Ligand binder design. Sequence first.
Ligand SMILES: *[C@H]1O[C@H](CO[C@H]2O[C@@H](C)[C@@H](O)[C@@H](O)[C@@H]2O)[C@@H](O[C@H]2O[C@H](CO)[C@@H](O[C@@H]3O[C@H](CO[C@H]4O[C@H](CO)[C@@H](O)[C@H](O)[C@@H]4O[C@@H]4O[C@H](CO)[C@@H](O)[C@H](O)[C@H]4NC(C)=O)[C@@H](O)[C@H](O[C@H]4O[C@H](CO)[C@@H](O)[C@H](O)[C@@H]4O[C@@H]4O[C@H](CO)[C@@H](O)[C@H](O)[C@H]4NC(C)=O)[C@@H]3O)[C@H](O)[C@H]2NC(C)=O)[C@H](O)[C@H]1NC(C)=O
Ligand SMILES: *[C@H]1O[C@H](CO[C@H]2O[C@@H](C)[C@@H](O)[C@@H](O)[C@@H]2O)[C@@H](O[C@@H]2O[C@H](CO)[C@@H](O[C@@H]3O[C@H](CO[C@H]4O[C@H](CO)[C@@H](O)[C@H](O)[C@@H]4O[C@H]4O[C@H](CO)[C@@H](O[C@@H]5O[C@H](CO)[C@H](O)[C@H](O)[C@H]5O)[C@H](O)[C@H]4NC(C)=O)[C@@H](O)[C@H](O[C@@H]4O[C@H](CO)[C@@H](O)[C@H](O)[C@@H]4O)[C@@H]3O)[C@H](O)[C@H]2NC(C)=O)[C@H](O)[C@H]1NC(C)=O
Lengths: 210, 213, 167
Amino acid sequence: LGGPSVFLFPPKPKDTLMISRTPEVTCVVVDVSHEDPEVKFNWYVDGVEVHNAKTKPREEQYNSTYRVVSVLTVLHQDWLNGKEYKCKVSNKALPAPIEKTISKAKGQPREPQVYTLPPSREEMTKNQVSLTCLVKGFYPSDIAVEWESNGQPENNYKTTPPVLDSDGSFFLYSKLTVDKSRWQQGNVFSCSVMHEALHNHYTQKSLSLS
Amino acid sequence: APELLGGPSVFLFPPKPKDTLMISRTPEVTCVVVDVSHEDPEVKFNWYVDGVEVHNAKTKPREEQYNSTYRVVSVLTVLHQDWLNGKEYKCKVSNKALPAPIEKTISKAKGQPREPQVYTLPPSREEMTKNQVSLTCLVKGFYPSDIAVEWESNGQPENNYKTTPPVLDSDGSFFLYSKLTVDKSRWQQGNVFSCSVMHEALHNHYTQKSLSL
Amino acid sequence: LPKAVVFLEPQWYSVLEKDSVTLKCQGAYSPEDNSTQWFHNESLISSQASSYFIDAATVNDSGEYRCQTNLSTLSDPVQLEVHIGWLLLQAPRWVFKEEDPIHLRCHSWKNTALHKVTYLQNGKDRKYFHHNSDFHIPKATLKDSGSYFCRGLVGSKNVSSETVNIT
Ligand SMILES: *[C@H]1O[C@H](CO[C@H]2O[C@@H](C)[C@@H](O)[C@@H](O)[C@@H]2O)[C@@H](O[C@H]2O[C@H](CO)[C@@H](O[C@@H]3O[C@H](CO[C@H]4O[C@H](CO)[C@@H](O)[C@H](O)[C@@H]4O[C@@H]4O[C@H](CO)[C@@H](O)[C@H](O)[C@H]4NC(C)=O)[C@@H](O)[C@H](O[C@H]4O[C@H](CO)[C@@H](O)[C@H](O)[C@@H]4O[C@@H]4O[C@H](CO)[C@@H](O)[C@H](O)[C@H]4NC(C)=O)[C@@H]3O)[C@H](O)[C@H]2NC(C)=O)[C@H](O)[C@H]1NC(C)=O
Ligand SMILES: *[C@H]1O[C@H](CO[C@H]2O[C@@H](C)[C@@H](O)[C@@H](O)[C@@H]2O)[C@@H](O[C@@H]2O[C@H](CO)[C@@H](O[C@@H]3O[C@H](CO[C@H]4O[C@H](CO)[C@@H](O)[C@H](O)[C@@H]4O[C@H]4O[C@H](CO)[C@@H](O[C@@H]5O[C@H](CO)[C@H](O)[C@H](O)[C@H]5O)[C@H](O)[C@H]4NC(C)=O)[C@@H](O)[C@H](O[C@@H]4O[C@H](CO)[C@@H](O)[C@H](O)[C@@H]4O)[C@@H]3O)[C@H](O)[C@H]2NC(C)=O)[C@H](O)[C@H]1NC(C)=O
């Protein structure tokens, strides 16, 4: 090999769900000499040239080398429908242009099932309490889960990364903590789940005592 | 074919947590070496237990081709206490196809060892609609990340289950969940199950908790 | 009687192992029996070759090399510095100052293919290269007082050269 390198990035998962968010696949080119800093980007969607579709570039200097960045905004549907996004970078010091395609995970998706699992008496000794919320049978792994406690974004709550199941789907927990008192003296919460399934790529499940 | 201009890399993997914790299990650390030169194979290793070599016994190759290049591995049966104590195991691969040898050194993570806490959680009512509920057991507040987990029902073990790897907890500790897939009935019919947790900070490197209705 | 003179081929005084070096003992010999004497650190060695050939350079082949003959006084000395590595920064001399383009070669063990090579001075990247290539300098300048060392990509793995002081 030897020459400029090219990396293609996809859009942020959450950006691809909230239509109010602007997705964008990014095509970075590194190892751009100071001798031939000319970088020609050509983008292609499902085979045809997107031309501009409003694609944007411009260069900067790091090591002692150059880095250019063209960026194509991805149309939600398109992206979600599995359209393939190709980026063709071609430098002068490049014997033949480099093509990089990226695309949303292939295969039919699956509606993530959410279940709130209250803490265990055995742990009702300690001062804090392990609230939990597993989500399983969803596909793909593109998911985010927060915790609305009082119309707020609670602090100390850890979530695990999805793990492949036997089906083909994935699952993941989300132990949310809270001082005993809180839950103790009867309070409520809910985990937020976002997948490319749910009515509006959104669903929430509540969990309190009783 | 595979051009290899470059020192066939080396990878060294630690031993399995259980094997380390069960005094009847032989934990072996392995030094895998890939990209071995067709025209320059077989390598000489060198294991340095915290300091000194250990040529004697503690050795085990057995070449084996692959993609289009060979692959040699060095197994080294450890010393439970040792390992579980901090012994830094070093491996040094030398192929006449490198300018010099490569030294990889792996050892048990350092930090105040922590005793876990296992809690078993019954599936959520809302899941009863399914033809398989999910017996879920947590495992919080422990360190290091090494640990094993299983499911005892009664006299004999389960398979249908998955576990997420440790996750650094907000308090420098660790944790995880292991979800069990049983059939609607099996659970409902009141059967009993046991989350089998193996870690170092255990009264006997073993604890438990049963889950029933 | 004149002194024999030892020359190097290639002209690189610092080299990697596996490299090939050749020490030639130029000069005149006696018409009656003309053997040459080579001296490694003022000591002999299989005495003959008008051109002692160091075929597979290793660390030990390092030291002061001198040569003599049936009609020459002990040659002046020549230093051969042999190192272990993937890369090596070469140059006739590191003590530079004026009117002379600083020639810096980044050499790779066994001459393997080196790419995306950088030339550094004080842990700072001074020059990048897509494919390995020597690092010269237009007009010598007093602003070249530092510590250099190159590094790049042999295949897909990184390699570096021991540091040096361009004085
Ligand atoms: C042809 O030959 C081989 C094999 O052929 C083909 O096989 C098929 C199946 C295909 O999947 C490919 O494997 C391959 O095409 C091929 O690959 C070999 O070289 C690559 C690198 O070039 C090796 O990659 C490394 O993989 C390890 C993990 O290895 C184990 O775990 C993986 C899990 O994905 C398994 O797939 C492996 O088989 C290994 O198995 C383990 O075996 C142990 C024995 O008991 C066991 O204990 C393990 O549990 C078990 N795992 C299983 C099965 O569960 C990674 O760890 C390496 O990553 C690190 O380096 C990369 C750089 O490449 C970094 O990006 C990354 O960050 C890692 O760096 C480490 O980061 C941590 C912090 O996170 C630091 O603490 C570490 O210090 C740091 N390490 C470093 C870099 O210093 C890496 O990906 C691959 O494993 C090799 N295969 C084999 C035989 O194992 C080979 O490339 C090909 N020839 C050619 C043309 O190149
Ligand atoms: C000299 O310097 C160059 C610049 O590097 C500089 O990095 C910074 C951190 C400095 O501090 C210094 O480190 C240094 O000056 C070097 O360029 C680098 O080259 C190497 C290869 O030689 C590249 O490595 C591969 O990187 C990819 C991806 O990396 C991601 O993560 C790193 C983590 O830090 C980021 O640096 C990087 O930018 C990548 O992700 C991040 O950028 C994306 C694009 O901007 C973000 O995506 C966009 O995000 C937006 C909002 O943030 C928006 O949402 C948009 O929609 C979205 O597209 C992205 O979000 C962000 N982080 C993420 C991921 O979330 C790796 O995948 C790859 O890994 C493997 O590599 C092997 C072999 O290559 C391969 O087999 C595997 O298949 C993988 O590919 C490598 O790690 C590195 O990315 C380059 N850095 C830069 C500038 O991008 C240059 O090489 C140096 N010169 C030399 C050769 O000496």
